[PDB]
Amino acid sequence: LPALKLALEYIVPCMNKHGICVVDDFLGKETGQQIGDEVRALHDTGKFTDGMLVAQKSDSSKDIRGDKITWIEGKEPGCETIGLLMSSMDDLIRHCNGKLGSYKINGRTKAMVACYPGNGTGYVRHVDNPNGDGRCVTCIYYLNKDWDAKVSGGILRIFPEGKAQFADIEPKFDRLLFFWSDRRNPHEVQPAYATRYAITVWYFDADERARAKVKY
Ligand SMILES: O=C(O)CNC(=O)c1ncc(-c2cccc(Cl)c2)cc1O
Ligand SMILES: [Fe+2]
Secondary structure (H helix, E strand, O other): OOHHHHHHHHHHHHHHHHOEEEEOOOOOHHHHHHHHHHHHHHHHOOOOOOOOEEEOOOOHHHOEEOOEEEEEOOOOOOOHHHHHHHHHHHHHHHHHOOOOOOOOEEEEOOEEEEEEOOOOOOEEEEOOOOOOOOEEEEEEEEOEOOOOHHHHEOOEEEOHHHOOOOEEEOOEOOEEEEEEOOOOOOEEEOOEOOOEEEEEEEEEEHHHHHHHHHHO
8 A cells, every 4th residue: 555545545534533543464464574573683682671660679689670672763784674664654654744633743753662571561551742842643563473462461552532431452463553642642551461562653743842942
């Protein structure tokens, strides 16, 4: 599917109506598996952090850590298919521009690659951008082959429009997810009992980002 068709016929109407959009089979099995291989190699060669401190504990031997991260620009050797994914995300957003709300998107973060180690940790309920830091759209790509949430957990639960009625999104292989980054979409990751990977980029709105500059 050409990016403009996906954008105009699906992403733009889904985002403006619901603030959330799920695209399955985004890149196809071959590219999806190559991204998986690159992320696993990052993991196996120690490129991730040790994980978010979950419980601090007076005996630090008992510390519990959760999601581990690494920031990826997309041009590093061994990361060029992650770079292909990132360019594919940009292609979609570029073909949306002027139609995602009244936002004018003019940049994005590097990719945050996340690894949940499977030790029963998740991610607490939160809003990505609660305080106007410039980020207007969250984009997540999942790469977990044959993920079964009834067995392994790890559901992303989003509370669309902030209301208590929630949407449960499995972190399925080759699934792409967009949602508004602000308080319209509080969300959380339920405990994961197997290794769970995801790649996130955030897109900036020009006006909000130009003002966040003075909030820094
Ligand atoms: O994995 C998923 O399906 C959902 N993940 C998130 O919702 C998330 N959100 C925010 C952050 C995050 C929040 C603050 C700082 C940084 Cl570097 C990352 C990490 C995160 O993993
Ligand atoms: Fe988040």
